[PDB]
């Protein structure tokens, strides 16, 4: 679990890794539809983060329909969570082979407090699919245009992506 240790470098928040997988079809796979999400663990320092991250496969090497989620401790990676329900996310769709580096850059910027939006960040997701990967960063208030504008600028600055790459913002409710 997460403890603050004098010899270690604290993060501004504790964060929790999550892992989900979806067996997407009844015809598509021989097995029946199945969906699972499991909390991996929670960490409080830079050194503790590396203990977890260095022992996880990079997302570009996951198979099937799988996701890593990295969210502030106490925020579930589900839009209906209190911390998320009035929020939204920046979405970046990537051709296969780019997600592992972009995920690392994203979560290092998030954990390191590089966004400068106070408490607005909820967490980040990398979703591995068959023909593309999707990376997103979620924030608390979807209607806070100044916040969501600052996140975009930091993303463009820290992610190291071709300037042709599109980014889209989506408010979680808009899905209903």
């Amino acid at each position: 679990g997460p403890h603050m240790l004098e010899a270690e470098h604290p993060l501004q928040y504790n964060y929790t890794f999550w892992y989900s997988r979806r067996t997407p079809g009844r015809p598509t796979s021989s097995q029946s539809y199945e969906q699972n999400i499991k909390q991996i663990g929670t960490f409080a320092s830079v050194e503790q983060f590396w203990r977890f991250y260095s022992h996880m496969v990079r997302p570009g090497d996951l198979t099937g329909h799988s996701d890593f989620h990295l969210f502030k401790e106490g925020i579930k990676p589900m839009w209906e969570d209190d911390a998320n329900k009035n929020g939204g996310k920046w979405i970046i769709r990537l051709r296969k082979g780019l997600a592992s580096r972009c995920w690392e850059n994203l979560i290092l910027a998030m954990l390191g407090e590089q966004f400068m939006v106070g408490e607005e960040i909820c967490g980040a997701v990398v979703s591995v699919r068959f023909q593309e990967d999707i990376i997103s960063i979620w924030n608390k208030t979807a209607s806070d245009q100044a916040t969501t504008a600052r996140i975009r600028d930091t993303l463009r600055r820290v992610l190291n992506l071709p300037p042709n790459t599109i980014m889209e913002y989506k408010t979680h409710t808009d899905s209903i």
């Binding site: 499991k38 663990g41 203990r51 496969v57």
Partner: protein
Amino acid sequence: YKLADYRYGREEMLALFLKDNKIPSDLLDKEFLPILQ
């Protein structure tokens, strides 16, 4: 304006990556076998 108390850039994060660690016990679950290295 208001800087966070604990701030690290990318290079600072990598600088603290200790090369001798122990896998957290939270990861030692059969469910995570596909994702362990």
